C-alpha cells in the first residue's frame, strides 16, 4: 500500500457488469455516482489504484477519513469521484508461516496529500538529534511489514483493494434487438431519434 500500483485506463469500453455482478467482492460502495448508474456515463481518464491492506482498515479507504493508511500510506481526497473494490484474499496472499512481502508506511513526518505515492525508505527521525540513516533510538524504519497468517482472524486477513478514480474515451455499451425493416419503428441510432 505504500507503493500502490496505479494504472491509467483509457480508449476503451468499460464494462462494469462483470464487476458488480461478480458476487465475489465483499466491500463495494460508490461515491459521487451510483454503481448501477455509472455504466452508461462516460469519463475521460480512469485510474485503477490497487494495493493489499489488512481487513480492518478497508474503512480507512474512504473520502474524509482519518487513520494510519488514510494518512501515511494512501489518502483519498474529499472530492473523490470513483469507488473502491475490496475482496478477501486469504487464499492467495496469506501464505503458511507468515507473509511479510506487504509493508505499510507507519512513521511519517506529515500526512499525505491525496493520490501521493511515497517510495522513500529513509530512516525516520522522531527526535531532535538526527541519526544519519542508522537504526537506533528515535531512528525507525518507516515500513512495518504485515504479519499475514491463515490462522489470523477475519479482520486480520489480507484484502486486495482496487480503487477506481474518475475524471472522453472511457465508457459502457448497448444495443437491444435486430434491425427492423418495412415497419414503423421509432428508432435510436447512436443517439439520433
Amino acid at each position, epitope marked *: 500500500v505504500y507503493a500502490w500500483n496505479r494504472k491509467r485506463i483509457s480508449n476503451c469500453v468499460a464494462d462494469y457488469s462483470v464487476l458488480y455482478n461478480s458476487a465475489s467482492f465483499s466491500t463495494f460502495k460508490c461515491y459521487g455516482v451510483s454503481p448501477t448508474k455509472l455504466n452508461d456515463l462516460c469519463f475521460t481518464n480512469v485510474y485503477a489504484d490497487s494495493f493489499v491492506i489488512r481487513g480492518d482498515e478497508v474503512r480507512q479507504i474512504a473520502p474524509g477519513q482519518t487513520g494510519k493508511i488514510a494518512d501515511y500510506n494512501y489518502k483519498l481526497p474529499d472530492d473523490f469521484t470513483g469507488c473502491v473494490i475490496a475482496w478477501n484474499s486469504n487464499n492467495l496472499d496469506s501464505k503458511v508461516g507468515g507473509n511479510y512481502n506487504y509493508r505499510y508506511r507507519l512513521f511519517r513526518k506529515s500526512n499525505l496529500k491525496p493520490f501521493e505515492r511515497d517510495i522513500s525508505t529513509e530512516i525516520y527521525q522522531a527526535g*531532535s*538529534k538526527p*541519526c544519519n540513516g542508522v537504526e537506533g*533510538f528515535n531512528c525507525y524504519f518507516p515500513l*512495518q511489514s504485515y504479519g499475514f497468517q491463515p490462522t489470523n482472524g477475519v479482520g486480520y486477513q489480507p484484502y486486495r483493494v482496487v480503487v477506481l478514480s474518475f475524471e472522453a474515451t472511457v465508457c459502457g455499451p448497448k444495443k437491444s434487438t435486430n434491425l427492423v425493416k418495412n415497419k414503423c419503428v421509432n428508432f435510436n441510432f447512436n443517439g439520433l431519434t
Partner: antibody, heavy 121, light 107 residues
Framework: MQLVQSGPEVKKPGTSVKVSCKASGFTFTNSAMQWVRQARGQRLEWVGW????????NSARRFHDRVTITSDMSTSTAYLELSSLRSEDTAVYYC????????????????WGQGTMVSVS | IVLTQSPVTLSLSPGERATLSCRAS???????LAWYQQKPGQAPRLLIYAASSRATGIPDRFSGSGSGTDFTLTISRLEPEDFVVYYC??????????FGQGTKVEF
C-alpha cells in the same frame, strides 16, 4: 501523562512473570518505551525496549532469549513476560516512556511507571 | 559499551557547589547521556535530556554540559532533598543503554 503499572507478583523459581504497564491520560504514538529492572540495593539495569507503534522489541544480552516485550496499541498497553524467573530476579521493574509532542518526540525517558515487586520465592 | 561514573559518594556539606561527571569508556554517539536521579526504593525521574537540555516541568539548579565522552552534571544549590543517588544513561548506542553505578550525594 502517567504510566500505571500492575501490582506485585509473588512467584516461584520455575514460573514466569507477566508484567503489564498501561498508559493513562493519552494514547501510544511512536513513543519507544523501555523497561528497567532494579534489584534492591543495586543499580538500575536495562531489560529491553519496544517501539510501541512498530512492536520491534529488542532485549539486552543477558536477557537475550527469555524475555518477550510485547505491546498493544488497541488497549494502549505494553507488556513484559520474563522466563524461568531465577532467584537472582527479585527486583522492581520500571516502564519508562519517551514523551512524544506530536510534531516530534523527545529524546528522554521522562514519564516512568511506579514499579512491580516481582518476588522470587 | 560500558559507562563508568565518578566519585561514588559526594560526602560534603549541603548548600554549596557540587559537580557530577560520567566518564564513558567508549564514546557516546550523538551525545545521548541523559541524567536521572532515584531516591532509594522509589521511581526514578528525569532531569537532563539529550545530555545537556533541562527537562520539561523540572525547575532550575541542574545543568548538563559537554558532549562526546567528557561530561558534566552541574548541580548548583544542594537542598536536603537533593541528597539522592544520581544516574547516567546511554540510550544512544544500540543495545545495553548502559546506566552508571550511581553516586551518593551525602551530608
Amino acid at each position: 501523562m502517567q504510566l500505571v503499572q500492575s501490582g506485585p507478583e509473588v512467584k516461584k523459581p520455575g514460573t514466569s512473570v507477566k508484567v503489564s504497564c498501561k498508559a493513562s491520560g493519552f494514547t501510544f504514538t511512536n513513543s519507544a518505551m523501555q523497561w528497567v529492572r532494579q534489584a534492591r540495593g543495586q543499580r538500575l539495569e536495562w531489560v529491553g525496549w519496544i517501539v510501541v507503534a512498530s512492536g520491534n522489541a529488542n532485549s539486552a544480552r543477558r536477557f537475550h532469549d527469555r524475555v518477550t516485550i510485547t505491546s498493544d496499541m488497541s488497549t494502549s498497553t505494553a507488556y513484559l513476560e520474563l522466563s524461568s524467573l531465577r532467584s537472582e530476579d527479585t527486583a522492581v521493574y520500571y516502564c519508562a516512556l519517551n514523551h512524544c509532542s506530536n510534531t516530534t518526540c523527545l529524546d528522554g525517558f521522562d514519564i516512568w511507571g511506579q514499579g512491580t515487586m516481582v518476588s522470587v520465592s | 559499551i560500558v559507562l563508568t561514573q565518578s566519585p561514588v559518594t559526594l560526602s560534603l556539606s549541603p548548600g554549596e557547589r557540587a559537580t557530577l561527571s560520567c566518564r564513558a569508556s567508549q564514546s557516546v554517539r550523538n551525545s545521548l547521556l541523559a541524567w536521572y536521579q532515584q531516591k532509594p526504593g522509589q521511581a526514578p525521574r528525569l532531569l537532563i535530556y539529550a545530555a545537556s537540555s533541562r527537562a520539561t516541568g523540572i525547575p532550575d539548579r541542574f545543568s548538563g554540559s559537554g558532549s562526546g565522552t567528557d561530561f558534566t552534571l552541574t548541580i548548583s544549590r544542594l537542598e536536603p532533598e537533593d541528597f539522592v543517588v544520581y544516574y547516567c544513561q546511554q540510550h544512544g548506542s544500540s543495545p545495553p543503554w548502559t546506566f552508571g553505578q550511581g553516586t551518593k550525594v551525602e551530608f
